[PDB]
Amino acid sequence: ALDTNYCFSSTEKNCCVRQLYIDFRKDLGWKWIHEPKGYHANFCLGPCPYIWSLDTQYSKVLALYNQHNPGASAAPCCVPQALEPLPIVYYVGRKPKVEQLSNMIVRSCKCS
Amino acid sequence: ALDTNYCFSSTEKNCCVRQLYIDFRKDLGWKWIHEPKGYHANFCLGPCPYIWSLDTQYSKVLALYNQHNPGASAAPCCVPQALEPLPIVYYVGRKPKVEQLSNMIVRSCKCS
Amino acid sequence: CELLPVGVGHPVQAMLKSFTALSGCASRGTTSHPQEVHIINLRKGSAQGAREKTAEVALHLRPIQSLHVHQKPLVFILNSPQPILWKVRTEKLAPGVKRIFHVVEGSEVHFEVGNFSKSGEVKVETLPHGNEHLLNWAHHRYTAVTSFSELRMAHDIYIKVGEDPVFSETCKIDNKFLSLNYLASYIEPQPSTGCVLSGPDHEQEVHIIELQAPNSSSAFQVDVIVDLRPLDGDIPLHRDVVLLLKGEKSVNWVIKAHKVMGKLEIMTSDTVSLSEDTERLMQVSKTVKQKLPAGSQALIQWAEENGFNPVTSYTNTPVANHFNLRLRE
Amino acid sequence: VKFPQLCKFCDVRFSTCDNQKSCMSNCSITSICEKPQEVCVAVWRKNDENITLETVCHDPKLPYHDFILEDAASPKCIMKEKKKPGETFFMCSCSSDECNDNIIFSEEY
Amino acid sequence: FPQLCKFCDVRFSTCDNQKSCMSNCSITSICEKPQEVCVAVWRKNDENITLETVCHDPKLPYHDFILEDAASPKCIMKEKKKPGETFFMCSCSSDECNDNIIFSEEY
């Protein structure tokens, strides 16, 4: 539900999606990729408050535990919700081919 | 795989369920259920290196980025996968009722 | 798709499942007594389906949460209105422990593994129907009762054998007393409205279940059990179905599929869990948590916009917590 | 209130505290009221042989034991003595959660 | 780990009679069969400078030439005379043969 535009246009300290650029060669070592050389791979981060878009009841229970027990070292975490596929084109032998590296760019985040 | 037995028989620092006693009145502050006054919800905790049960290739991408760039603070988080409903008995008016509060016992933890 | 009552043969059957007891009490004072006594005062239900066949009631015995293995002898005063076959499906109980089942005339005790039958004993006695009279008889023949429970007639009875320290040392039948250690599970049909737009397709099917409330007085998330098994016979089937689960409140959908194969698509606005039986037997796509529309027609149109058309069937159950899905051959 | 009050809902039973300035219901049942509108209600009757204490969820609009409830919005269960013949009758009502659990016959002093 | 190899077709290289230069091949591809080794052929001539890089099985000759250098993990250019222009053939089986191109150890 929390799209990238919502947190990019307006900064929200809650669980959101933060900008981060990942290059295939230097970062991931995917030296077999032709194009793009890198891309923007936003990552989910941000503390989770009780009053926010939460789906799992366990996350709500753990958030309430933290509220009533601030020192617990166990709180719901900000993790990817919807991951966008990455369209790439490269060469197999001497034949061009276009593939879709599924779940490569973050588009949503969730507290769980 | 990363169930209660796996991480309770042997101590593993990676993503798994760890013991946690959830008390409604004291730890959770819930008083709308007569009993169980308290139960066990083993919470997900522990980081996952690159070589782990990373179902989504984006998690592998984050792990590789962190390994090559430790100063990124963008790594997969330990999240419950399958949660067991908890039976509860509570009174509404003068009528007792037994319900199943779903997704508050965490058994399987993945990384994402 | 006119909202009309759902027929018996509809592939979606909506049932409400609840664990409850008519009354009962528990006592930890039987610790001194070398033998523990549990009373299950079954009461005949209003259902007319039990006329000739002798009702056979199973039993599920487990150690209490505070105990891992139970070895003390357990006496069961299983008074019933009529003779019943007691299929004692024990569990996590040490073998060789004597288990005296005081039962009405004509009632038999059957055990899954013969070891329990060889070690156990069955005594046939005539016992009063009244709960107070039965408790007095138990006190007279044993001097104490570990627990008493008046339950309506049912097919299974989950008992957690053991003396719970929370309960006092005295047992007093209280209509407001209810505990997890002694419960009887009941399931009954619930009204629903729906339609069938397309017939059974062997390629891919779309069955939509709409839920308004899980019949819970609280405002939290509870489990909604959806069963998926062949409509006729035990022959496994290779079929693909689409499940659009709508919950106005928060409800976690637990889907259990038995003897079904193929690919299953689940779309809902609430978290979904799948039993290992469904996971191994069938390939279920990872659902994306979407703010689905509201109303039968809106959800139907949304699904048609995703290509998962035509709708095999749509059904809506205002009040229930259990669903059964049956696949036509 | 969207969430109905969580009131102690033990029916008539024997009690140990008599006309105490502050007392606790000692009720082991903390039930969600059938409706949000109804609030916690506590009644305390004293006779020549025994004393009874009853805690329930009751609608303040509807009189209880032939007595209208005007302390519905009271954050605490403020106890008013009634003119019940023969026996001594006290009754309090409160809209807070588990508020009837704590009983104050006379908070004064 | 991924193996990077030069798979550019017959192109022109600005490094003639040079000790070593960049791969001068922005195109990267994965070989059709796993056993294929990566062969670079150089035919520098006065008229023009032409080089090619492909990936193929060591057993099958390339341009009617026997590839006996496929056992070398790194691309080392062996010199063979050919009418018109000199021939320099290297074959590599190790990963990442595009790091640099070596024509002769001696400068």
TrEMBL record, chain C:
Coiled coil: none
Top-rank taxon: Eukaryota
Localization per Swiss-Prot or TrEMBL: Cell membrane; Secreted
Name the record gives this protein: Transforming growth factor beta receptor III
Organism phylogeny: Eukaryota, Metazoa, Chordata, Craniata, Vertebrata
Residues of the full protein shown: 31 to 359 of 848
